[PDB]
Design a binder for this molecule. Structure first.
Ligand code: BGC
Length: 396
């Protein structure tokens, strides 16, 4: 046995699978065995359940898709391996933005390797559906509702949305970023500031979320994010509020920007970039050949060729800084420009819904408040903000 790579991840949709296939291929070309542990469940909760079993099993995966502050917990447990030598040889501190490199370190040592930078705060449009409905691509919340009114009148699903908590909170966080702005967003989700969490603007975010719910399919419970994307691709819906992993579904269907889809910053979030960094935390392994395979995985993750093909298929930006951005599609080039702009000011903000801003316990509290609210058409925004602050406090 040359050594086996076992990555625990949740890349299972048609688009996500095309991306992870590029990793499988490179590992095989490098002469190692690929043994997949893909665990289906958008946003990763199902994967995390499997991980919690496997991690203290004595047979951990080579790596697992573990993001944000949660990397600190796995590092604190002593389960991850330090990557000093591979990081030095492959110049990771030079290749990675400082903001990103810090997330990957436990007590100053790399313990995880990033593969991308997803943008969460996108809105996906089907321009052909917009043309049929006489609708205008929205740049403001008011325009978003105007477009939704027209799509509805035209007999389309205005907003294709799946009723799962992480999806609900993806929409909610877009609203918070839009209404509060990036500094307010940071105060609420990173600093967990009580006055922000319970303020009039957060209250208005909940009122806006409730209205948005009136423009979704009432029987959307359980609908996977790729199902929602398909409604837009197939011309049944006008819009989807989702990160740029949605682009992977458009690309996998052979669709092109302008003609088939557009993406625009979520209305009112122009200038802000809510980032989601997929990273592979590397577990301490026992088997010598599997350690060699793991070291190969760590090398591959930031190789220029892999950074290109993975991210072309995945819908995200590459995380490596020296890349020829002209090799990506127009939407990814827009993402790059928007990242650069955001990074100059205070616009670059970690996604709460995608595990970058908070611990998982705090995220879970927020998810519960937001679905409970959106599940109840009669719910009150003033109560929601009190529950939001209270539940966050109890989760810590
Ligand atoms: O499953 C949908 C998306 O969930 C996000 O949390 C992950 O970071 C993405 O890689 C994935 O495509």
């Amino acid at each position: 046995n040359p050594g086996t790579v076992d990555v625990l991840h949740w890349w299972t949709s048609g688009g996500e699978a095309k991306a992870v296939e590029t990793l499988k291929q490179q590992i095989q070309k490098d002469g190692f065995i690929w043994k997949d542990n893909a665990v289906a469940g958008g946003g990763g909760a199902a994967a995390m359940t499997v991980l919690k079993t496997r991690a203290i099993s004595g047979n951990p995966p080579s790596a697992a898709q573990i993001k944000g502050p949660d990397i600190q917990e796995w590092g604190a447990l002593g389960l991850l391996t330090e990557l000093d030598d591979v990081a030095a040889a492959n110049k990771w501190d030079d290749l990675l933005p400082r903001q990103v490199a810090d997330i990957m370190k436990y007590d100053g040592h790399y313990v995880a390797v990033p593969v991308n930078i997803h943008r969460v705060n996108w809105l996906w449009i089907n321009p052909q559906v917009f043309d049929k409905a006489g609708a205008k691509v929205p740049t403001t919340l008011d325009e978003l509702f105007a477009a939704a009114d027209k799509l509805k009148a035209a007999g389309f699903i205005p907003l294709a949305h799946g009723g799962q908590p992480w999806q609900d909170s993806t929409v909610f966080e877009d609203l918070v970023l839009s209404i509060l702005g990036p500094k307010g967003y940071h105060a609420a989700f990173v600093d967990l500031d009580e006055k922000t969490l319970t303020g009039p603007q957060m209250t208005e975010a909940f009122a806006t979320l409730k209205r948005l719910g009136t423009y979704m399919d009432p029987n959307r419970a359980g609908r996977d994010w790729n199902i929602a994307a398909a409604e837009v691709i197939n011309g049944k819906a006008g819009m989807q509020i989702m990160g740029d992993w949605a682009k992977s579904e458009w690309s996998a269907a052979g669709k092109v920007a302008g003609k088939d889809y557009q993406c625009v910053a979520f209305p009112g979030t122009q200038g802000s970039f809510a980032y989601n960094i997929d990273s592979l935390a590397m577990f301490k392994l026992k088997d010598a050949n599997d350690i060699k395979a793991q070291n190969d995985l760590a090398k591959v993750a930031l190789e220029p060729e892999f950074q290109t093909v993975f991210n072309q298929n995945k819908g995200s930006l590459p995380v490596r800084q020296d890349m020829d951005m002209s090799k990506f599609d127009a939407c990814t080039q827009k993402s790059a420009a928007d990242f650069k702009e955001a990074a100059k000011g205070d616009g670059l903000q970690p996604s709460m819904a995608h595990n970058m801003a908070t611990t998982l316990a705090v995220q879970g509290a927020i998810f519960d408040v937001v679905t409970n609210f959106l599940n109840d058409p009669q719910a009150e925004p003033a109560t929601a903000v009190k529950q939001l602050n209270a539940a966050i406090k109890a989760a810590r």
